[PDB]
Write a protein that binds this ligand. Sequence first.
Ligand SMILES: CC(=O)N[C@@H]1[C@@H](O)[C@H](O[C@@H]2O[C@H](CO)[C@@H](O[C@@H]3O[C@H](CO)[C@@H](O[C@@H]4O[C@H](CO)[C@@H](O[C@@H]5O[C@H](CO)[C@@H](O[C@@H]6O[C@H](CO)[C@@H](O[C@@H]7O[C@H](CO)[C@@H](O[C@@H]8O[C@H](CO)[C@@H](O)[C@H](O)[C@H]8NC(C)=O)[C@H](O)[C@H]7NC(C)=O)[C@H](O)[C@H]6NC(C)=O)[C@H](O)[C@H]5NC(C)=O)[C@H](O)[C@H]4NC(C)=O)[C@H](O)[C@H]3NC(C)=O)[C@H](O)[C@H]2NC(C)=O)[C@@H](CO)O[C@H]1O
Ligand SMILES: *[C@@H]1O[C@H](CO[C@@H]2O[C@@H](C)[C@@H](O)[C@@H](O)[C@@H]2O)[C@@H](O[C@@H]2O[C@H](CO)[C@@H](O[C@@H]3O[C@H](CO[C@H]4O[C@H](CO)[C@@H](O)[C@H](O)[C@@H]4O)[C@@H](O)[C@H](O[C@H]4O[C@H](CO)[C@@H](O)[C@H](O)[C@@H]4O)[C@@H]3O)[C@H](O)[C@H]2NC(C)=O)[C@H](O)[C@H]1NC(C)=O
Ligand SMILES: *[C@@H]1O[C@H](CO)[C@@H](O[C@@H]2O[C@H](CO)[C@@H](O[C@@H]3O[C@H](CO)[C@@H](O)[C@H](O)[C@@H]3O)[C@H](O)[C@H]2NC(C)=O)[C@H](O)[C@H]1NC(C)=O
Ligand SMILES: *[C@@H]1O[C@H](CO)[C@@H](O[C@@H]2O[C@H](CO)[C@@H](O)[C@H](O)[C@H]2NC(C)=O)[C@H](O)[C@H]1NC(C)=O
Ligand SMILES: *[C@@H]1O[C@H](CO)[C@@H](O[C@@H]2O[C@H](CO)[C@@H](O)[C@H](O)[C@H]2NC(C)=O)[C@H](O)[C@H]1NC(C)=O
Length: 222
Amino acid sequence: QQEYLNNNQLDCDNTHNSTYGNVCNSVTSCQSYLTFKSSSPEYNTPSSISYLLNSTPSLVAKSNNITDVTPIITDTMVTVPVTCSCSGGRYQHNATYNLKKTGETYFSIANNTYQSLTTCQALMAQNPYDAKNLFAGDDLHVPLRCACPTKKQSDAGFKYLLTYLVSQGESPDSIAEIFGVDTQSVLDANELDSKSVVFYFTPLLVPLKTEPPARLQIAASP
Ligand SMILES: CC(=O)N[C@@H]1[C@@H](O)[C@H](O[C@@H]2O[C@H](CO)[C@@H](O[C@@H]3O[C@H](CO)[C@@H](O[C@@H]4O[C@H](CO)[C@@H](O[C@@H]5O[C@H](CO)[C@@H](O[C@@H]6O[C@H](CO)[C@@H](O[C@@H]7O[C@H](CO)[C@@H](O[C@@H]8O[C@H](CO)[C@@H](O)[C@H](O)[C@H]8NC(C)=O)[C@H](O)[C@H]7NC(C)=O)[C@H](O)[C@H]6NC(C)=O)[C@H](O)[C@H]5NC(C)=O)[C@H](O)[C@H]4NC(C)=O)[C@H](O)[C@H]3NC(C)=O)[C@H](O)[C@H]2NC(C)=O)[C@@H](CO)O[C@H]1O
Ligand SMILES: *[C@@H]1O[C@H](CO[C@@H]2O[C@@H](C)[C@@H](O)[C@@H](O)[C@@H]2O)[C@@H](O[C@@H]2O[C@H](CO)[C@@H](O[C@@H]3O[C@H](CO[C@H]4O[C@H](CO)[C@@H](O)[C@H](O)[C@@H]4O)[C@@H](O)[C@H](O[C@H]4O[C@H](CO)[C@@H](O)[C@H](O)[C@@H]4O)[C@@H]3O)[C@H](O)[C@H]2NC(C)=O)[C@H](O)[C@H]1NC(C)=O
Ligand SMILES: *[C@@H]1O[C@H](CO)[C@@H](O[C@@H]2O[C@H](CO)[C@@H](O[C@@H]3O[C@H](CO)[C@@H](O)[C@H](O)[C@@H]3O)[C@H](O)[C@H]2NC(C)=O)[C@H](O)[C@H]1NC(C)=O
Ligand SMILES: *[C@@H]1O[C@H](CO)[C@@H](O[C@@H]2O[C@H](CO)[C@@H](O)[C@H](O)[C@H]2NC(C)=O)[C@H](O)[C@H]1NC(C)=O
Ligand SMILES: *[C@@H]1O[C@H](CO)[C@@H](O[C@@H]2O[C@H](CO)[C@@H](O)[C@H](O)[C@H]2NC(C)=O)[C@H](O)[C@H]1NC(C)=O
């Protein structure tokens, strides 16, 4: 289990513990998965998505049953295999981001560019620049959100945790159905209960018994 971000990432003066990253509470490194919605024209191939998220094109291709050069229609969700490791008491997967235009902010980078796979709080904690003093060309250390299964999760047969980007209209039930897991395990993974509200544009951990479905668009259809 990890705390649910609960929209605390949308206010960069908020200092809730969850915003600094999942907590290192199990094995210190593991295989994990992110998700990402194809964004045209900058982040819609295995090469560009892997560049942003520091995966590899072959890993993205294999995970989604495409080739390493197959373009991906805008707004399609793809799985992104990554290594998740402990650093400074947190689980994260490291990437690097060079700002493209002055006017980008820790918030726009975390929320828009990285689609809530990181938070402005973790970016600020792990980079030297003041929020009001960022410019094109600055290179940021990006701590992407991932975790490794706890002992309790592992004993239940969960081999991986996947960071899932929630879209408008989904629920813990509909997301669990995509992956063939029970809704209660999704709730447990995020320290939520059956009445908890889950927001769109906020990530949610999904425990997996096996590799995720290769094409999520069809898994997500009713
Ligand atoms: C039958 C049944 O039960 N069905 C169930 C379903 O109902 C259910 O589905 C769920 O249903 C829910 C209920 O409907 C629904 O909940 C709703 O969810 C909504 C979406 O989340 C939510 O809306 C949210 O609400 C939040 C909270 O209010 C809003 O958050 C605010 O957002 C603002 C942006 O829009 C934030 O602001 C920005 O803040 C940042 C700082 O953090 C700031 O950044 C700084 O900017 C300055 C410049 O301006 C920067 O400074 C500059 O820096 C540069 C670079 O250095 C310099 O060059 C420059 O000089 C310098 N300038 C200056 C002047 O200094 C600075 O650097 C930045 N700082 C940093 C660190 O980067 C920005 O400027 C701010 N922007 C603006 C525009 O002001 C604001 O902080 C934030 N507020 C808070 C408090 O966080 C969101 O906007 C809003 N989102 C939307 C889309 O509207 C609703 O409230 C929810 N409602 C309820 C009732 O809960 C669920 O989503 C829904 N789920 C799903 C999946 O559909 C399901 C599921 O449970 O179940 C069914 O069963
Ligand atoms: C941010 O969150 C961190 C994670 O918190 C937990 O995880 C999430 C998912 C939720 O479930 C949340 O409710 C959990 O708390 C949090 O770090 C945690 O902080 C607590 C503080 O209470 C630590 O508890 C202390 O643990 C020791 C034993 O260590 C245990 O944990 C470590 C973690 O790996 C394991 O390695 C060990 O094997 C143990 O399992 C206890 O000795 C101690 O109890 C008290 O004992 C003395 C004597 O009474 C008191 O004087 C002390 O004050 C102690 O309170 C603590 O309870 C917990 O270990 C730690 N976990 C991890 C993984 O780091 C962190 O504090 C949060 N930060 C902020 C700023 O909120
Ligand atoms: C990964 O993607 C490829 C390409 O999209 C999928 O290959 C397609 O799947 C079917 C099932 O194996 C192939 O076999 C044949 O399909 C036809 C469908 O009419 C059927 O007549 C045959 O009996 C046979 O099942 C199909 O040719 C193939 N299409 C292409 C263009 O290669 C593949 O299934 C995907 N794999 C996974 C694990 O998702
Ligand atoms: C990811 O980046 C972090 C820094 O954000 C690196 O953290 C180091 O982790 C090792 C091993 O846990 C420690 O010895 C260092 O002291 C840590 N540094 C900090 C600043 O916390 C981490 O090495 C990076 N991981 C990978 C795999 O590249
Ligand atoms: C956080 O990022 C999301 C995208 O990841 C933003 O959603 C976009 O909002 C703009 C409005 O400026 C729309 O044109 C886009 O269509 C939206 N994208 C999607 C995928 O729906 C969102 O505005 C950002 N900010 C907040 C506070 O959520």
